Structure formats: structure tokens, C-alpha cells
Amino acid sequence: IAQARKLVEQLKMEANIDRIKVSKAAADLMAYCEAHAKEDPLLTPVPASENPFR
Amino acid sequence: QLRQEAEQLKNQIRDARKACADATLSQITNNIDPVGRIQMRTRRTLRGHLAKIYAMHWGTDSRLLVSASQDGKLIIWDSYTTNKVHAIPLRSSWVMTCAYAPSGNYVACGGLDNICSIYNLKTVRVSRELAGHTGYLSCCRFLDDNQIVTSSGDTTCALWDIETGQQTTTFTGHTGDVMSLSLAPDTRLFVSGACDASAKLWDVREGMCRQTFTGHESDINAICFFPNGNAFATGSDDATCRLFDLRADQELMTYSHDNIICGITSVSFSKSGRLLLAGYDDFNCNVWDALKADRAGVLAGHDNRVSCLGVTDDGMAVATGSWDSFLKIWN
Amino acid sequence: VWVVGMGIVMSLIVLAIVFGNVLVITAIAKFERLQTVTNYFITSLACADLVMGLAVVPFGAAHILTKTWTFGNFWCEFWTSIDVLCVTASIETLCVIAVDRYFAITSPFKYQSLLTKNKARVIILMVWIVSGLTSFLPIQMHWYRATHQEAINCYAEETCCDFFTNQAYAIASSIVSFYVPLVIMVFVYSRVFQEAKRQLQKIDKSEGRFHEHKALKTLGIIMGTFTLCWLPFFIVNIVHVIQDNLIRKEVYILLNWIGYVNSGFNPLIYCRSPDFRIAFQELL
Amino acid sequence: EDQRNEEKAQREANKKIEKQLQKDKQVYRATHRLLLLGAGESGKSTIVKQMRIGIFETKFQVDKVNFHMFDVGGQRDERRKWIQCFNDVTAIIFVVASSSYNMVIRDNQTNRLQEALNLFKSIWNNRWLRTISVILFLNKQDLLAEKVLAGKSKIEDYFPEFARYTTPATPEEDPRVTRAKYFIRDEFLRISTASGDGRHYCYPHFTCAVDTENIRRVFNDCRDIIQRMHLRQYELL
Ligand SMILES: Nc1nc2c(ncn2[C@@H]2O[C@H](COP(=O)(O)OP(=O)(O)OP(=O)(O)O)[C@@H](O)[C@H]2O)c(=O)[nH]1
Ligand SMILES: CN[C@@H]1CCc2c(ccc(O)c2O)[C@H]1O
């Protein structure tokens, strides 16, 4: 009963959340990826002089 | 009558999420140039484990790592020189997870025996044994040098206290087994993926669930978390990996292929967040493009299934563990 | 004409012997899974067969075709030494493999302790040392040499290189090389066949109502190829010494070359497991 | 240079570790591991205790051969996600209550036997246990005889297939108990042999409360399992 009630309190709690459109989220993710692109040695092969595994 | 009462709320949540769907992530990311082919060559190979490997966790300095096998042994390696440092026998030979503390002082492990044990590296003897779970442990991550969070098979996750040995907070709400978790960069929130095909977002300080995502169809075996702190990716048994979003509160992209019918056992991101690495049961790994959903390479060389995966803190190398009792370092 | 045709067959055979053995050696070489305690004896066998294919066969082919030995007497002695060493080291390895299978099947609980990677190296080294002690030692020295006038003429001359031997060595080398490693293999495979038949009978008794050919075929092929290849020559060897003039040189040479072929077949017989086939598919 | 000392220290440490790893690997390869699995009310604890005379483990040695057995009790779940960890064991020991056929609930469950049959079918067809044999202990053989002989209840009432079944045999007794026992055993043999593919078999047995020879049966069955695996590996079976 209460457990049944619980699934009601939890459902009410998560119901009222302010949400932004997915366009803003996609833009933020793309901006982050483009900003920190050059600092990814895995994506861009660095010279073997700085590679510690060569 | 109460059970009936709840859905009106679920329908409202679904309607709100559908209203918030302004566009598609694929549509916005349409002019992005492809990353092209990505080739990785094995640089190091680590041997010494007598049986299959179920876990590993890169050190905080991106030099050392720990691994756990089913012969009941933890070995702390050294990636640069491929020579061991420690070998720790275990009381119980069934271990399913391991962790390595951010300060580099402690190492934890647990398994079918419902006990989480930590070890003191700078002294190798057992420091504290934590008990209270009624099922096997799936994962455990060092939140700090004094408190740790674990997820077990009794559909609960708990926050522990090393000095006292007693649970501080208990998280409840899942229906089936819990299989993985991941902590935010600031260690303020963490997510968990269960066997009822649902992922939940918790608050560590308070102890209440904030959101829930139920996009998958089968059990969830792995979960990672975006470097920015506003997204996370999951891997399930239905050969699909999805990318959710905390602010928008629904999924954005799905990664799948018609020629893949096996499962996923591990998921990890890269330093910049552009790539997504996932391990499969077809004895090989795959590399995905996060913003375009297209394969960009394959990592073959394992003779048995892959059960672990991790990327260094500085993003220089990726390590894979497999049931072939071998570890490899790619670059 | 006929000479050119024989030359063609010979050239074609040296190739197969080299290729099969080099292919077998590379795969154990290129893959971690294949290595195993049982897979070192196969490596030793492949190495011996490769050495024989490179060294023994081409020089003998040149001698047969040119009808005269151009090389020096010392090189003739060295060639005979290499021939005997390779032939006698390519059979005791088969005996060792048979014994290993016997231990693996008959004693299932004690296989792990009895065989260890450290003992395999000792066994292989002992086998090769026994092979070399009966090949170089009595041949580089002149303890096998015959006594009749034709033998003296052949030994003194630097143009001809023929094989002449006395009774003692012709019997001792044959006993060491062939006869001893045969009864062991026969006894081992008979025991293995009995065990297989017993297990098949047990399965049939347990669940026959709800639902020995493979074993017979495998044992038959394994025993038959070796016995057919190497049996006639090692009886001709003794006969041509006990009684004079019965066996001509041509028959002796032909039956000797029949034995050389067997090293080609070993990759086909001992490497039909799925792992080796997958490895072969992997490279080349 | 002059750090040339630390490296040497790491090189020494690696060898020190490797020696002990080899020494322990010998013992690890020496021993055999078994898994004990059974349904409720089967009699697992009694059998384990008689053989002796989270996870619970017992070690025994027969003829200088070390055996290691684990019974995982934890707590009940139909999802069994932890069983994928037991795919390198020698064999799986299955214990079933033979006399609990006419026990409808344990509810409105299918007779408990049917639940045991469904569990066995799930175990047999698992993807990670494709090459693991099963040792079957049909426990409680005296209560079954009591229920069959001079018994109001009948097998045909719960299992309609018993109506048109005839004995196949090794009687040791009464004519009814042999038919009942062999029908029950065939009900498992059918499932075992439906999709065996020849890589793993089943070895049914008939145990009781006062039996003392279970350990010898386990020893013999493990020896047969290893011998059959070796025979099949070399293409002789
Ligand atoms: N007659 C008979 N009864 C048995 C046998 N084994 C167990 N039992 C019965 O089982 C009851 C409890 O003993 P155990 O069988 O060890 O425990 P259990 O009830 O099987 O518990 P689980 O094995 O966990 O289901 C006793 O009252 C016994 O009567 C047997 O071989 N013969
Ligand atoms: C020249 N050919 C030799 C002559 C005698 C001989 C051979 C092989 C094995 C032996 O034990 C032998 O005694 C032949 O290969």
C-alpha cells in the first residue's frame, strides 16, 4: 500500500522539472567538443617523440 | 486504486518530454566533417593472470593500473615498463569488480561474497571489511579517501564510511539487479544502470532520486559519463548504445548496426568526448563517433570476449581486458 | 627425356616438404593459443623434416641426375651424417607423441603433474642427443666402413659417393631407429583403442534408446601411413647385409626415397585440428 | 643516468613476483572445481553433510586428488546473472527431490517437479554453459517408494504421460517403484539428450538418506568426464 503510495511520491517528485529544448543541449555538446578538440591525443596522432608508449 | 492513480503523471511526463523535442541531434550535426579512419596498434601486452579477467581501473596518474581475475589475485602493473609491482591473494576467489583510490593509497575489491574489502598499499594487509549487502557486488568507486559508494545485487546502492564501517546513506528504488555506476567529476551526483532496463540519477548528499531514463529494452551492463557533466551513455544486451541528456531529460542518439547481434560489456569516452569506445561479445571492440553515429575503427586481437575497458586521465592510451587472461594497451 | 621428367617430379617434391614445414612452424610462431605442451613435439618434428628437406633431398637428387658426385669426399660423409640424423630423429618424436597421448588418455587426473613445460625441453633435448650420438659419431669416424675391394675402391676414389656398411652397424642403427619405436606405438594405440571402445559402450548403455568408426579410421590412418612409408626399407636394410646379391642398388635407392616422402605427410596428419586450420586461414 | 638503480629494483621485483605466480599456478592447475545447485526442499544440505562425513565452500580429497565445491545460497532470484562465472568448472551437481511430484505448491505453482524440470532445461540451454556436464542426484528415493506402493495418489493424475509408458533395465523390490523411478529419470534424460550435440552429457543417479557412496560416484563421474573430453579432443570419439 505505502510502497504503492511510494511510487506515487517519486512520480510526483520527478514530474516538475524545468526542461530546455534539445537544440540547446546539442549546441552545448558540439561547442564543447569543438573547443577541446585539439587536446585529444587519441583523436590526433602526436609525434613519436612525445609518445610514452613507443 | 493507487496504482491507477500514478499513470496520469507518467502520461504528463511523456507529454512534456515530447513537447521539449525541438529537433534531432542528427539534424543539428549535419555539416560536421567526419573524423575518418582511426587505426590503433597494440603497444604493450601484459601476462601473468591464470584465469579470466573481470575488471580493471586506471590509476590517477595514468601510469599504474590494477586488475582482478578469477584465480583470486589483484596485480598492480606499470604500463611504461610492463613489470608488476604487487600481487595480493584474496580470501574469496570470486571477484567481479575493483577500484583504485585517487590518492593512490588504497585498493578495493568485492564479489560473490557480499563483502567489500579495501587494502593499504603504503604500509599489504586488509584494512577494513565492509558488510551489510544481501547480494553480490557489481561495482565500487572510491568517492574519497574515507568514503566509498557500492552497488550490489539486492537492488540497492549504499554510501559507506571506512573509519566506522557502517552505511551512511542507502539508495533504493530499482527493481532488478544493479550492474554499474559512474561518478560525476565533482562527485556530487552519480548514475546507475540496472537489469530492469532503467537508469537513475541520484544525489549523494541528500539521498533521493532525481530523474529516470527507460529507453532500453534489455539489461544494462555498462555505463559511462560525459566529460562535460551533462550527459551519459549506456550499453545494453540488445546490441545498442544510447546517449541521454540530464537537462533535456531524454535520449539524443542511438548507435547500432544490422550486422551486430551480440551484447555490450563496457563503455568509455575519450578526453574530448568526440569518440565513444564500446566492448562487445564478438571478441573485438568498436569505436564510434559521438556526434554522427558512425563506426570509425575496430580493435581486434582478443581471442575471447572483452569484459573491461578504460581510458587514461590524460587521454593517451586505452586498455582492454578479456577472458583470454591478457591485457593490451592501444595508442 | 625421362631424365627431365624425373627431374621435374623431384623439384616439385622438395617444394612441398619445405612449404608444409615452414607453414607449420610460422603459425605456432604467430599465435599464442597454439603453444602448448603437446605442440612442442610437433615443432621438433617440423624442424627435423625441414632440415632434411633443405639438405638431404636436393643433393641426392643432383647425385641421381648427374650420375656422379662432384663434391668432395668429406662433403659426402657430411651428407650421409645429416641423412641418418634426420631420419633417426623424425621417428622417435612420433614415439614421444604417442606416449604423450597415452598418458593424456589413460591417466586423466595425473596428466598435469606428469607433463610440464620444463620437462618437455629436457625430453626433446635427450631425443635429439640420442639421434645425434648414433649419426655423426660413427660416420665422421670410419667405424662403419666395409672391407671388400669394391668398398675400398669407392672410399679411396673422390668421384663416387655410395653407402657401404658392415653387419654390426646396419643392425644397430636399424634397431635404434625403427624397430624399438614401433612396438611402443603399437602397444600405446591398442590401449587407446580399448579405452575409446569402453567409453563408447558406456554411452550406448546409458542413453542408447533415446538416440567405433571415427576412432578406427584415425588410428588406421595414423599407423598405416607411417608403417607403409618406413617399413619396407628397414627390412631391406637388414636383408641386403645378411645375404649378398639379393637386393640391387636401384631397389635399395627407390625404397630409401619412398621413406623420404613421409615427412611431407606429417603436416596433413598431425595438423587437422580446427585451431591450426583457423591459424592457416589467418595468414596466407 | 644514476636512476639505473631503480630500474634494477623493478626488474628484481618482477622476478620475485613471477616465481610465486608459477608456484601457485601449479596448485591451481592441480585442483578440480564443482558447483552444487538444487531447488528448495531438495535435500542439498543433508547430502553435503553426509559427503563430509554468501558462498559456502567445502574441500575433500579422494585418492590424493583435491576436489573443491561451492554451494551458492545467497537469496532467491529467477534472474541468475551470476551463473556465467561458473563456466570453467569440471561439472555441475544437480539435486532434485524425487518424491515431491504431487506437491502442487511451494502459490498454485506447477507441481514442484515441473519447476525442477524447467530449471534444468534453463541450465542445459544456457549459452555460457555449452560444455559443462551435469551430475544428477535423484534424492529421496524412499519417500517416493512409500508414495507409490500402497498409495492413493497416482502419477497419471498430475503427469498424463504416465498412462502410456512401459518400463524400458536394472531393477534391484516392487514392480511399481521401478516403473515410477525410470519414468522420472527418463523425463530428465529426454531433455538432456534433445540438444546435447555430443559436447556434454548427463549421469543420473539414485541416492537416499542413508547412502554413503556419493563421493565415489562423484569421483568416477569426474574421471569419465575428463577422459571423454580428452578422447573427443583428439578425434577418437
Ligand atoms: N527420507 C529422506 N529425507 C530427507 C533426505 N534428505 C533430506 N531429507 C529431509 O529434508 C529435511 C531437512 O533436511 P535437508 O534435506 O538437509 O534440508 P532441506 O529441507 O532439503 O533444505 P534444502 O536442501 O535447502 O531445501 C529433513 O526433515 C529430511 O526429512 C533423504 O535422503 N531421505
Ligand atoms: C644413405 N641413406 C641412409 C642409409 C642407412 C640408413 C638410413 C636411414 C636410417 C638408418 O638407420 C640407416 O641406417 C638411410 O637414409
Burial of C23 (0-12, 13-18, 19+ CB in 10 A): middle
Q: How many C-beta atoms lie closer than 10 Å to residue C249's C-beta? A: 10
- Cell triple for A12: 510526483
Closest CA to D148 of D179, D171, D170, D172: D179
* Residue positions counted in chain B: 331
CATH for the stretch D1-237: 3.40.50.300
* Residue positions counted in chain A: 54
- Cell triple for C188: 600405446
The CA distance from D222 to D208, in Å, is: 21
Instruction: Answer for the pair C25, C45: CB distance below 8 angstroms, yes or no.
Output: no
- Cell triple for B143: 568517492
Which letter, b or e, does each residue of D62-75 get, where b requires 16 or more Cβ atoms within 10 Å of its Cβ? eeeeebbbbbbebe
Q: Give pairs for D11-19: CB < 8 Å, separation 24+.
A: D11/B83, D13/B83, D13/B84, D13/B85, D14/B83, D14/B84, D17/B48, D17/B75, D17/B84, D17/B86, D17/B87, D18/B48, D18/B84
The CA distance from D13 to D25, in Å, is: 18
Diameter of chain C measured on Cα atoms: 77
The CA distance from D114 to D94, in Å, is: 15
**Secondary structure class of C154 (helix, strand, coil):** helix
Measured from the CB, is residue C163 less than 6 Å from ligand 2? yes
Element (H, E) at D129: none
Closest CA to B75 of B94, B98, B42: B98
The CA distance from D56 to D73, in Å, is: 8
Measured from the CB, is residue C80 less than 6 Å from ligand 2? yes
Interface partners of chain D (CB pairs < 8 Å, 3 or more) are B, C
Interface contact flag, D28 B50, Cβ < 8 Å = yes
- Cell triple for D94: 544437480
Which residue is closest to B326 within chain C, CA to CA? C32
The residue whose grid cell reads 531438495 is D42
Measured from the CB, is residue C263 less than 6 Å from ligand 2? no
Task: Give the ligand with the smallest distance to the CA of D144.
Answer: 1
Burial of B105 (0-12, 13-18, 19+ CB in 10 A): middle
Closest CA to B21 of A13, A11, A26: A26
- Cell triple for D119: 530449471
Q: Looking at CA atoms only, how far is residue B238 from chain C in angstroms?
A: 29
What distance lies between CA C87 and its chain's CA centroid?
6
Task: Give the ligand with the smallest distance to the CA of D37.
Answer: 1
Instruction: Answer for the pair B31, A26: CB distance below 8 angstroms, yes or no.
Output: no
Domain ranges of chain A: 1-53
- Cell triple for B142: 572510491
Instruction: Answer for the pair D125, D82: CB distance below 8 angstroms, yes or no.
Output: no
Those residues with Cβ within 8 angstroms of residue C138's Cβ, 6 or more apart along the chain or in another chain? C144, C169
**Secondary structure class of C209 (helix, strand, coil):** coil
Backbone angles phi, psi at C277, to 5 degrees: -65, -40
The CA distance from B137 to B160, in Å, is: 14
Q: Whose CA is nearest to atom 25 of ligand 1?
A: D41
Instruction: Answer for the pair C262, C226: CB distance below 8 angstroms, yes or no.
Output: yes
Element (H, E) at D135: strand D133-139
HEC readout, C34-85: CCCCCHHHHHHHHHHHHHHHHHHHHHHHHHHHHCCCCCCHHHHHHHHHHHHH
Amino acid at C152: I
Crossing angle for the helix pair C2-30 and C249-270, nearest 10 degrees? 30
The CA distance from D237 to D235, in Å, is: 6
- Cell triple for B217: 529494452
HEC readout, chain B: CHHHHHHHHHHHHHHHHHHHCCCCHHHHCCCCCCCCCCCCCEEEEECCCCCCEEEEEECCCCCEEEEEECCCEEEEEECCCCCCCEEEECCCCCEEEEEECCCCCEEEEEECCCEEEEEECCCCCEEEEEECCCCCEEEEEECCCCCEEEEECCCEEEECCCCCCCCCEEEECCCCCEEEEEECCCCCEEEEEECCCCEEEEECCCCCEEEEECCCCCCEEEEEECCCCCEEEEEECCCCEEEEECCCCCCCEEECCCCCCCCEEEEEECCCCCEEEEEECCCCEEEEECCCCCEEEEECCCCCCEEEEEECCCCCCEEEEECCCCEEEEC
Instruction: Answer for the pair C264, C279: CB distance below 8 angstroms, yes or no.
Output: no
Closest CA to B137 of B119, B113, B159, B158: B113
Residues 27-46 of A with CB under 8 A from B: 27-30, 32-33, 36-37, 39-43
Instruction: Answer for the pair D220, C105: CB distance below 8 angstroms, yes or no.
Output: no
What is the domain class of A1-53 according to CATH?
few secondary structures
Determine the distance separating the centroid of ligand 2 and the alpha carbon of C82, expressed in angstroms. Answer: 10
The CA distance from B331 to D86, in Å, is: 34
Domains and CATH numbers, chain C: 2-282 (1.20.1070.10)
Element (H, E) at D91: strand D91-97
Cα radius of gyration (chain B):
20
User: Distance of CA C174 to CAs C165, C182, C230, C251, Å?
Assistant: 12, 12, 11, 18
Local structure of residue D32 (DSSP, 8 states): E
Q: For residues B171, B172, B174 and B179, what is the CA-based torsion angle, rounded to 10 degrees?
A: 30
The CA distance from B181 to B183, in Å, is: 7
Q: Looking at CA atoms only, how far is residue A26 from chain B in angstroms?
A: 6
Closest CA to D116 of D134, D97, D99: D97
| DSSP code per residue over A1-54 | -HHHHHHHHHHHHHHS-----HHHHHHHHHHHHHHTSTT-TTTS---TTT-TT-
